Design a protein around this ligand. Sequence first.
Ligand SMILES: CCCCCCCCCCCCCC(=O)SCCNC(=O)CCNC(=O)[C@H](O)C(C)(C)COP(=O)(O)OP(=O)(O)OC[C@H]1O[C@@H](n2cnc3c(N)ncnc32)[C@H](O)[C@@H]1OP(=O)(O)O
Length: 388
Amino acid sequence: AKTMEEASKRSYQFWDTQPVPKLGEVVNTHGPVEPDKDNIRQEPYTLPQGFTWDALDLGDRGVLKELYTLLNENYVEDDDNMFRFDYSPEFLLWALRPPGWLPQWHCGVRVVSSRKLVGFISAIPANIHIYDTEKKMVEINFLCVHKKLRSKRVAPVLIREITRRVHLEGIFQAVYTAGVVLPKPVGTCRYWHRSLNPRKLIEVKFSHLSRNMTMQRTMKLYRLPETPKTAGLRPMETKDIPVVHQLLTRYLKQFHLTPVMSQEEVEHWFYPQENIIDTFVVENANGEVTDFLSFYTLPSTIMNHKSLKAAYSFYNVHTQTPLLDLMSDALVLAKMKGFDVFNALDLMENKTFLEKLKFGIGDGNLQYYLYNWKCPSMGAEKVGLVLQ
Ligand SMILES: CCCCCCCCCCCCCC(=O)SCCNC(=O)CCNC(=O)[C@H](O)C(C)(C)COP(=O)(O)OP(=O)(O)OC[C@H]1O[C@@H](n2cnc3c(N)ncnc32)[C@H](O)[C@@H]1OP(=O)(O)O
């Protein structure tokens, strides 16, 4: 299902057995769908014959490359099946080894006879704020089955097995996103795209000519200053970690689904690493950081035939610089860094700048979910959580 009426007509054999609300039910309650089980299965779940569990050591360069290759060739595509994500090995270490990562949560599936990696799912620890509750959860990401093993019910085994391994660590709630509709979305978001290199975006058919426009007029439409306007703007440095933590923590209080990051987590997620994560702060006249913007790097391979370099807005905190100016500088910085497109969701306060800043709304939805938690749904503007 891609919309909820698609999901209105479908049977959920696996998800009906899971502690998540039914799609049809209207939810007002707050808390777990079920009580925690205090004795947990020690044995890993049975895979189909010919397949075996292997926890992937991503500190081993060969195993990280095995994982990269699986995701490069089998992970999320667009709705039109024209572009596939091209996660780099250094991005995967960033996304998969934040503070608190556990090796048993890098859960791969291999072919027994050849040891070929054919499946994967991951959990990372995350302190999550949902409405008035702050709880330790896991973020689930990179669920992936090889194309040659699709529609053999392997995905429910991966979900059950990462659940069991998370339960063993005493965690009973999880958060995750998906482009398909399942029981049951807590929030719904849409991707918006801001062209920065419109010629390239049209040759690879990511974008197309508006009616009677011309490349020369479209390039004119999306032109940017190429030197940012805000004074005091500069890359984040080690000395900025405490204030960036401070700024983010207070900014996120206005949203209903937010992460709660320690100072070490703020360092991991925001300290710049070239081709992975970019963060820029705005220092004022008296030397105090008052704003910062962030976006991460995720290229997309062109499926028909190298890649489209895409920036994704991460967390943007404004206390003195107007958010529109802050995001305008982010577009400039992305274009100086060679990015062809700048993506962002309609969550947090992004709606206040998306149209003004020439973003075009894209196709497909991004659903947010909680596992084993009852809460009312919320609008995109209330979601304050971005996952990689
Ligand atoms: C306490 C801690 C709990 C931890 C667990 C929290 C929950 C974590 C939940 C997972 C968070 C993922 C977060 C991300 O990473 S979202 C990204 C998902 N990845 C991709 O789209 C990559 C490309 N696709 C694939 O590799 C496969 O098609 C996948 C693996 C997606 C499905 O494999 P396959 O196509 O071969 O199907 P099947 O026959 O094996 O199995 C079909 C059953 O699986 C249900 N299904 C299909 N797609 C998804 C999906 N994307 N999330 C959850 N469930 C999904 C499906 O409705 C059906 O259930 P039901 O209709 O029978 O009920």
